Design a protein around this ligand. Structure first.
Ligand SMILES: Nc1ncnc2c1ncn2[C@@H]1O[C@H](COP(=O)(O)OP(=O)(O)O)[C@@H](O)[C@H]1O
Ligand code: VO4
Ligand SMILES: [Mg+2]
Length: 730
């Protein structure tokens, strides 16, 4: 038993190293310590000091340098006894304080132990390096073990969810939180791997396909951002489905909010979606020929950030992986080819150069890019050109051709690319889901991997929707961990004295998505269907409604085009530029007519399938992006509310994507804003386990002298409470 064998990889990689003679000595010391701030300005940088004296209300301690300091016992952050250093469950700590919590995570991190329990949920600190803890052998160990019998691991939280599914015959969810680059997506992948393994029908196809969906989605939905070289630029809710038996019956992926604008624009040093680089790199010369491709430097859509490659990554090699995945998922050779033609057409489109013509309306002097694109997409070039520069619209009922200028024509070509891309993405997912749909699921374990909280020099509409989503997910944790928990206690009249954990994202949530009074999204929507609205009228309106009126909102004095929102993770300044267009998400209809006529089977679907091509209508207008997403999100949350949730809090160690470099301020801000300590305090202070008397009696009347057919209901009364319908236990 590797679990017992100090020589096992399990022991080696998942357990705290045996401390030494000396350590033993320090461990038995009678000395007492405190965590303190050598510099009170830097409240997150602590030192260890020996408590030398004490009064009824204070502690006197020595500082590093050796000097002595005094503190109210009240404000003291006592250091836990060293035997606690590296503890698997921080709820065991005697002293629950910031520096102590960070310390324990630091101890574990320093020996490559990235997983640590915080009471009922898991904390995962990104290592920024490979740790061999995810092998089959590793998986095998977790298999069916109680959380308590094994070390903290994403596999273990996965097993528990799985057991709870089968035990309670209830659906579950694995909610993995974190800011951008925290490790949500790596963890998610581990969750899937585990489930596939432990509930996989052995004798691995459905299962491998489930697995294989991954690289396809990431090649098309991930990109290098300044915070993450493999940033998920869309969110996903993966439903792992199981039959009555507990075997994996299927899976389903729901995608959210693809950052379509990345296809046409990328900030300095970032990348466009990986796929673009994989194709250019992994394409054959025969393919490169037929697609009229060159290197990324030859394309405006890939040659503006200053970055075409990611250290340690081989686009050409990933291309092969993407392709095999498509192969395993089942995409036909023809399908794949159309897929690449679409990518290639996008690239050429991007190369179209509009020029001012006669007067205002634009002209296209060189048709190379235009012809190349038309040729790969299987659409008519003149038709496409007219659709770009002179699209037709109704003026009342009259039909008028517009004559767009250089700026509008480019924006339109951009809009066409974005729709091509977003719809291709949706098609890839739908294609994947259809392959994976083969059973009327008895249960599911849903894994949520969203784009996490992010802040850039320029935060736009995409950032707002992302951060809003992260704010809602945090609220869901708050709700679950504290709101609902206490209500049960209070409900069951167990004499719980309500505690205010001080964590509440409601006000921020409301500021954003409130109806009445209207929040930011409501106002954006109103202005969005207002004929004379401009980004300027929009911002003015936001300010008029929230400036000096909403606590979570700020109208900055240093800018006229930005507004600030105070999220759980920090305040973010948003630039209003393009918001109406972004919310409206327009696309000239003549563009769509051009594409519905494509000789390409895939292109056709993107434009002809109402599942992909159709826009929903809200009265006299089509639905906006905001309303639409707000709705998707609300629906997600409702679904989650029907599951038994398990939280994984991913923690980023620093902002450099470096291993072995745990930054205290970095980590502490996350622990603070995620509600980690409060969450530990609740686990401690309260009563996790509870059972209705009758299901308790019925279940086991056997330990009894007691019938099977409440009050009657030895074991110690310290760890138990008597509720009004159930009894509670620790
Ligand atoms: N458990 C882990 N093991 C190894 N590397 C990891 C782990 N978790 C995260 N990483 C590293 O951090 C990077 C960002 O992680 P990721 O899951 O993509 O973040 P996000 O939370 O943004 O999804 C990964 O590409 C990988 O380099
Ligand atoms: O960087 V991530 O949080 O996958 O968008
Ligand atoms: Mg991710």
């Amino acid at each position: 038993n590797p679990i017992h064998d100090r020589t096992s990889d399990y022991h080696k990689y998942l357990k705290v190293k045996q401390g030494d003679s000396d350590l033993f000595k320090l461990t038995v010391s009678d000395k007492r310590y405190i965590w303190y701030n050598p510099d009170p300005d830097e409240r997150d940088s602590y030192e260890c000091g020996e408590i030398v004296s004490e009064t009824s209300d204070s502690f006197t301690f020595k500082t590093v340098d050796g000097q002595d300091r005094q503190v109210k016992k009240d404000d003291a952050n006592q250091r836990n006894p060293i035997k606690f250093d590296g503890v698997e469950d921080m709820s065991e700590l005697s002293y629950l304080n910031e520096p102590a919590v960070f310390h324990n995570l630091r101890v574990r991190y320093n020996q490559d132990l990235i997983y640590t329990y915080s009471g009922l949920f898991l904390v995962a600190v990104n290592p920024f390096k490979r740790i061999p803890i995810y092998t089959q052998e590793m998986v095998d160990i977790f298999k069916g073990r109680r959380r308590n019998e094994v070390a903290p691991h994403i596999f273990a939280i996965s097993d528990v969810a799985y057991r709870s599914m089968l035990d309670d015959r209830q659906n579950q969810s694995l909610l993995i939180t974190g800011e951008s680059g925290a490790g949500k997506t790596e963890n998610t992948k581990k969750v899937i791997q585990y489930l596939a393994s432990v509930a996989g029908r052995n004798q691995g196809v459905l299962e491998q396909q489930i697995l294989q969906a991954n690289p396809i989605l990431e090649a098309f939905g991930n990109a290098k951002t300044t915070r993450n070289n493999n940033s998920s630029r869309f969110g996903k809710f993966i439903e792992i489905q199981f039959n009555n038996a507990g075997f994996i019956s299927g899976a389903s992926i729901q995608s959210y909010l693809l950052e379509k604008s990345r296809v046409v624009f990328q900030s300095e040093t970032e990348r466009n979606y990986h796929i673009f680089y994989q194709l250019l790199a992994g394409a054959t010369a025969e393919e490169k020929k037929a697609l009229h491709l060159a290197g990324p430097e030859s394309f405006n859509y890939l040659n503006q950030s200053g970055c075409v490659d990611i250290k340690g990554v081989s686009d050409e090699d990933e291309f092969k992986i993407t392709r095999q995945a498509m192969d395993i998922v089942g995409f036909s050779q023809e399908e794949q080819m159309s897929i690449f033609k679409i990518i290639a057409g996008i690239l050429h489109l991007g190369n179209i150069k509009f020029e001012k013509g006669a007067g205002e309306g634009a002209v296209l002097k060189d048709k190379t890019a235009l012809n190349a694109a038309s040729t790969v997409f299987g659409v008519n070039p003149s038709v496409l050109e007219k659709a770009l520069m002179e699209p037709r619209i109704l003026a009342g009922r009259d039909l008028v051709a517009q004559h767009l200028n250089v700026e509008k024509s480019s924006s339109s070509r951009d809009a066409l690319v974005k729709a091509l891309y977003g719809r291709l993405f949706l098609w890839l997912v739908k294609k994947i889901n259809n392959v994976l749909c083969s059973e009327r699921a008895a249960y599911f374990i849903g894994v949520l991997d969203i784009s996490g909280f992010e802040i850039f020099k320029v935060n736009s509409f995409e950032q707002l929707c992302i951060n809003y989503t992260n704010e809602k997910l945090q609220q869901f944790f708050n709700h679950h961990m504290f709101k609902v928990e206490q209500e049960e206690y209070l409900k069951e009249k167990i004499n719980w004295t309500f505690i205010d954990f001080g964590l509440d994202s409601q006000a921020t949530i409301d500021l954003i998505d409130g109806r009445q009074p209207p929040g930011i999204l409501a106002l954006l929507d109103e202005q969005s269907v207002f004929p004379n609205a401009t980004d300027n009228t929009l911002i003015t309106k936001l300010h008029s409604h929230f400036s000096k009126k909403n606590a979570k909102y700020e109208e900055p004095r240093f800018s006229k085009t930005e507004f600030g929102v105070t999220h759980y993770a920090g305040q973010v300044m948003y630039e209003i530029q393009d918001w109406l267009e972004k919310n409206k998400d327009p696309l000239q209809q003549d563009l769509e007519l051009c594409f519905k006529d494509s000789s390409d089977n895939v292109v056709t679907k993107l434009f002809n399938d109402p599942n992909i091509a159709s826009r929903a209508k809200k009265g006299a207008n089509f639905i906006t992006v905001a309303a639409q997403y707000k709705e998707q999100l609300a629906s997600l949350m409702a679904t989650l509310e029907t599951t038994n949730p398990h939280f994984v809090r991913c923690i980023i160690p620093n902002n450099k994507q470096l291993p072995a470099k745990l930054e205290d301020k970095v980590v502490l801000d996350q622990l603070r804003c995620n509600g980690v300590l409060e969450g530990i305090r609740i686990t401690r202070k309260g009563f996790p386990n509870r059972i209705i008397y009758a299901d308790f009696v019925k279940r086991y009347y056997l330990l009894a002298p007691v019938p099977r057919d409440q009050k009657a209901t030895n074991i110690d009364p310290e760890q138990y409470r008597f509720g009004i319908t159930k009894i509670f236990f620790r």
